[PDB]
Design a protein around this ligand. Structure first.
Ligand SMILES: Nc1ncnc2c1ncn2[C@@H]1O[C@H](COP(=O)(O)OP(=O)(O)OP(=O)(O)O)[C@@H](O)[C@H]1O
Ligand SMILES: Nc1ncnc2c1ncn2[C@@H]1O[C@H](COP(=O)(O)OP(=O)(O)OP(=O)(O)O)[C@@H](O)[C@H]1O
Ligand SMILES: [Mg+2]
Ligand SMILES: [Mg+2]
Lengths: 70, 51, 405, 395, 108
């Protein structure tokens, strides 16, 4: 304070998870990939773990780049 | 029965806790201070427990 | 080694007691609501704004350890708990003193800075740390049971209007115990200190204690009442000690009025409980001589003494300088007797056949106590007969009870 | 009244400011004897609480093998115990003597600091610390008396060089005696105001105590504390309380009080030298004093405060009527002639009552008639209670 | 000190001129000496109690180096309002008293 004056003076309902996806056992029953995606899983996505995805189209495969260990 | 046993074992430790003095209040003071007289040990100015 | 030299002059505490402390604001004059009082008050306000801004700035950049709540919180840590109550025996130095615990053991301890050094006198109750016994405070001594007994807490309901016939007697007592306090300017412009002491003497029941009751009713000073027979003690020296302590309490509660009622009873009555005989009473008398007018400077302490036997008092006790005024209380005359009867029957419900003129000559040596006793007993006769109206027969039977038998 | 509204606004702001100032400044409370926070050296106190250890007061009793290099000291720790200890390394061996109080630690009880001798707090308070407001100019009619009193109790301390050169031993005691109101304590109060040495006021009734041997003990500590000073004055007001003559009435009549007088007599002139103490005794009953106390070497000078003469009474009238708003032509010589044998206290009352007759009459100036009425009221009307007639026989 | 005492409260420009003239001629190091503190006092005494007659003088004091300039202007400004009671003037002095330096910088 200055001197005294003297007398004079909107959380989203969803989230996209990349691959790999850190997914809870509880997220399993609520996680499902978008319908329009080119890939479709073999077993239901609520099972979890490693799932192999079927390929509807035959375009260029946009894979993920492996990360070197620390 | 479990509470009776549990209280019995804890009593042995409790009974080893030092006893409390017996004093007489002369007057109350500010900041929860009380002037007391311990029976053989004269006067003291003591705190007051929060309870 | 060399003895420590104190920097404080003397070994006694500061005489001033119970001041405004840091709130001793100046007496701005005049009290009238005008410009310069506003101007004077503004200057007081201005410096406070300066004071407020300066203090805030220092504490703002003061270390977290050094804060007003932190230092006070620290002070408890240095004091610790419990705080042992001791007795100050001697002040060796400014920060050093000898104190004695309740067990009778003395310790040479250090007086901490936060203790009020001006309150320290030998014999005072001090607060000591439980572990290191260092002086960490001074316990304000509670009011002694002896202090409470002398002090008249509630002013008596008897006023000057309830006194009849003692016009001159009332007037003389006012100039020595009432006028100096209410109107001190009259004395100052005249260049005289007020009459020092006063004694009220006369036959029993003449109104000596009543005038003191009227004095205590309309006084702004502390009133201490002591009967002369209370100064006769069971042990040697306690008689002089009680007189010394009685006038010490008067000095603390200045201004004060000390009423030594029935002063002659100290000598006219001999009790076996008083170990020393007439010799111990004489020592008590000599102590009272010192208090009334002695070496010690006396504050605003006014002394009133009452006695029905003034011939038995030591003349040195009532000498001028000690007791300046000797007000005589004569037996009431016809005019006063009628006034006393009207005073004590004002709240009564008298009958049409009761005349006060006949009751005036109930006895030749009639006093105010006899008149009040006649009325009080007369009402008691009506209370026995379940009546609110006091008849002449009730008063007639009253005289034969109090005055006779 | 146009500023009544503005007064209270700045008064309330001021009162809020002191309450606000006291919040940060502190100093609230004092019942535990707390000094204002401006005097709190908490940094030093924490060091003091650690560096300076507490010391128990003990009295040395006997020094064992003082000649050798291992001197053992026997100490009496009040009510605690008795210990055979050695001196600390920070205190000289010659600084502790037998029978003196010492400070000892709580671990090995080694003597750490010599201490002053124990003195009763009541005796300590008996010394005067505020000098009275009475000077020798306030005493009238006592010219010759005052010079005799000063030349024994004031001159030797002020100018000691004029006595040692001629080999003069000045008297060390003065007895002031006279009827009440003659000015015995007034002159003593003048002595204390002017004196620069220590002045101790003792009242004879203060030496009367409940237990046996106290009055003698208090006298012993009184002179013991007086001897700890280069020059001292002890005033014994109303010495006749304890100074009465010894007698044997079969029973133990005044035996304890006589011992108090005997101890006082021993200190004044006994085997040991008294010191540089000059005692001053005042009494209105000198006929009752013990012959040994009324003897030179204990009471060398006997200054009599007799009733003032006409010149003296006129002087006292001027002293007390100095600040009065008296008339121009007040005949004070006449007033002194109207009270032949009257004490100075009566003259003061005459002056006070003279202004009382004028204050009663709502007059700001006291006429000569008021003094005439004052003499009648004081000297004549109050002559029944006068202490002069009985006390001139005693003096 | 002397010429300030002879011409105290007179605002004599002749004594004023030299007191400035000696002050800024002196080197920064010798201004550390405490006998140089008497030069502003002589200037202050020469304007003792005048009040609003120092701004021209205070203008000349800005040229003088620090911390003596802090010392110099404070001394003359105080002497200008001596015996005036101006609460506004004592407002700035405590503002100097508010900022505490961890001696050489706090000489003023
Ligand atoms: N002059 C009087 N006017 C009115 N009431 C009086 C008067 N004198 C005495 N009394 C009454 O008498 C009562 C008792 O008398 P009081 O206690 O005053 O006696 P005293 O004169 O002090 O005598 P003592 O103490 O010697 O007996 C008082 O309470 C009062 O009501
Ligand atoms: N010589 C005097 N000159 C001026 N005033 C005097 C003189 N003598 C006495 N007085 C006044 O009379 C008062 C009487 O008190 P003082 O102490 O002098 O009495 P005292 O002689 O000690 O009496 P007591 O024998 O009763 O103790 C003094 O306070 C003082 O005001
Ligand atoms: Mg009574
Ligand atoms: Mg006396």
């Amino acid at each position: 304070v200055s001197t005294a004056v003297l007398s004079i003076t909107p959380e989203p309902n969803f989230q996209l998870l990349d691959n790999p996806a850190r997914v809870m056992p509880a997220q399993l029953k609520v996680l499902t990939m978008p319908e329009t995606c080119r890939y479709q899983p073999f077993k239901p996505l609520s099972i979890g773990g490693i799932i192999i995805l079927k390929d509807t189209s035959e375009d260029i495969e946009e894979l993920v780049e492996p990360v070197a260990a620390h | 029965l479990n509470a009776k046993v549990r209280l019995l074992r804890e009593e042995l430790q409790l009974l080893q806790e030092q006893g409390s003095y017996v004093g007489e209040v002369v007057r109350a003071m500010d900041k929860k201070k009380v002037l007391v007289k311990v029976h053989p040990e004269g006067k003291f100015v003591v705190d007051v427990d929060k309870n | 080694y060399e003895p420590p030299v104190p920097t404080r002059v003397g070994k006694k505490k500061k005489k001033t007691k119970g001041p405004d402390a840091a709130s001793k604001l100046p007496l701005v004059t005049p009290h009238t609501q005008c410009r310069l009082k506003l101007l004077k008050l503004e200057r007081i306000k201005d410096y406070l704004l300066m004071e407020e801004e300066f203090i805030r700035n220092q504490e703002q950049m003061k270390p977290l350890e050094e804060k007003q709540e932190e230092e006070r919180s620290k002070v408890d840590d240095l004091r610790g708990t419990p705080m042992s109550v001791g007795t100050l025996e001697e002040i060796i130095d400014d920060n050093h003193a000898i104190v004695s615990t309740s067990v009778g053991s003395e310790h040479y301890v250090s007086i901490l800075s936060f203790v009020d050094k001006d309150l320290l006198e030998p014999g005072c109750s001090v607060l000591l740390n439980h572990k290191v016994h260092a002086v960490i405070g001074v316990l304000m001594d509670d009011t002694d049971p002896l202090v409470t007994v002398m002090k008249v807490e509630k002013a008596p309901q008897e006023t000057y209007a309830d006194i009849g016939g003692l016009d001159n007697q009332i007037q003389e007592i006012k100039e020595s115990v009432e006028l100096p306090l209410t109107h001190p300017e009259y004395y100052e412009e005249m260049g005289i200190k007020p009459p020092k002491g006063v004694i009220l003497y006369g036959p029993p029941g003449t109104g000596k204690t009543l005038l003191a009751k009227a004095v205590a009713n309309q006084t702004s000073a502390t009133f201490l009442r002591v009967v002369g027979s209370e100064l006769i003690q069971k042990y040697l020296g306690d008689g002089p000690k009680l007189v010394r302590e009685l006038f010490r309490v008067a000095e603390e509660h200045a201004p004060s009025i000390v009423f030594i009622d029935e002063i002659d009873a100290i000598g006219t009555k001999r009790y076996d409980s008083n170990s020393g005989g007439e010799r111990e009473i004489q020592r008590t008398m000599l102590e009272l001589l010192n208090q009334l007018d002695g070496f010690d400077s006396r504050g605003d302490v006014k002394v009133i003494m009452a006695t029905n036997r003034i011939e038995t008092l030591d003349p040195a006790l009532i000498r001028p300088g000690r007791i300046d005024r000797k007000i005589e209380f004569p037996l009431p005359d016809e005019k006063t007797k009628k006034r006393i009867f009207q005073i004590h029957t004002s709240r009564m419900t008298l009958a049409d056949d009761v005349t006060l003129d006949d009751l005036i000559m109930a006895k030749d040596d009639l006093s105010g106590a006899d008149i009040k006793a006649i009325c009080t007993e007369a009402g008691l006769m009506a209370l026995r007969e379940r009546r609110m109206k006091v008849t002449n027969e009730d008063f007639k039977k009253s005289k034969e009870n109090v005055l006779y038998k | 009244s146009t500023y009544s509204r503005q007064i209270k606004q700045v008064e309330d702001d001021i009162q809020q400011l002191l309450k606000k100032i006291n919040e940060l400044t502190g100093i609230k409370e004092s019942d535990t004897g707390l000094a204002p926070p401006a005097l709190w050296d908490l940094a030093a106190d924490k060091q003091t609480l650690q560096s300076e250890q507490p010391l128990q007061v003990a009295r040395c009793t006997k020094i064992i093998n003082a000649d050798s290099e291992d001197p053992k000291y026997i100490i009496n720790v009040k009510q605690f115990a008795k210990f055979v200890v050695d001196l600390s390394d920070q205190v000289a061996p010659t600084d502790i003597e037998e029978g003196m109080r010492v400070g000892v630690d709580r671990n090995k009880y080694q003597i750490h600091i010599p201490l002053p001798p124990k003195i009763d707090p009541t005796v300590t308070m008996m010394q005067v610390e505020e000098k009275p407001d009475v000077t020798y100019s306030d005493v009238g009619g006592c010219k010759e008396q005052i010079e005799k009193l000063r030349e024994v109790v004031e001159t030797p301390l002020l100018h000691p060089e004029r006595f040692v050169n001629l080999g003069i031993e000045p008297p060390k005691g003065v007895l002031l005696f006279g009827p009440p109101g003659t000015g015995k304590t007034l002159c003593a109060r003048a002595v204390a105001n002017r004196t620069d040495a220590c002045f101790i006021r003792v009242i004879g009734s203060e030496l009367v105590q409940k237990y046996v041997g106290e009055g003698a003990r208090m006298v012993r500590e009184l002179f013991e504390m007086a001897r700890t000073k280069k020059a001292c004055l002890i005033f014994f007001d109303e010495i006749d309380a304890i100074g009465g003559a010894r007698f044997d009435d079969g029973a133990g009549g005044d035996n304890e009080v006589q011992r108090t007088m005997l101890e006082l007599i021993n200190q004044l002139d006994g085997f040991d030298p008294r010191g540089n103490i000059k005692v001053l005794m005042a009494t209105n009953r000198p006929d009752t004093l013990d012959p040994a106390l009324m003897r030179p070497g204990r009471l060398d000078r006997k200054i009599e405060f007799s009733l003032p003469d006409l010149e003296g009474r006129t002087h006292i009238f001027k002293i007390h009527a100095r600040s009065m708003s008296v008339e121009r032509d007040i005949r004070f010589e006449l007033l002194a002639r109207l009270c032949p044998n009257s004490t100075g206290a009566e003259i003061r009352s005459v002056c006070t009552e003279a202004g009382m007759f004028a204050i009663r009459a709502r007059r700001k100036i006291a006429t000569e008639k008021d003094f005439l009425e004052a003499v009648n009221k004081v000297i004549k009307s109050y002559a029944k209670f006068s202490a002069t007639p009985r006390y001139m026989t005693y003096n | 000190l002397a010429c300030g005492m002879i011409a105290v409260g007179s605002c004599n420009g002749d004594v004023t001129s030299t007191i400035l003239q000696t002050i800024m001629e002196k080197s920064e190091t010798e201004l550390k000496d405490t006998y140089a503190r008497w030069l502003p006092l002589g200037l202050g005494l020469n304007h003792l109690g005048k009040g609003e007659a120092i701004e021209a003088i205070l203008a000349a004091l800005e040229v003088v180096s620090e911390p003596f300039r802090s010392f110099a202007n404070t001394l003359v400004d105080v002497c200008a309002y001596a015996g005036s009671g101006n609460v506004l003037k004592v407002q700035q002095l405590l503002h100097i008293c508010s900022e505490h330096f961890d001696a050489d910088m706090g000489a003023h």
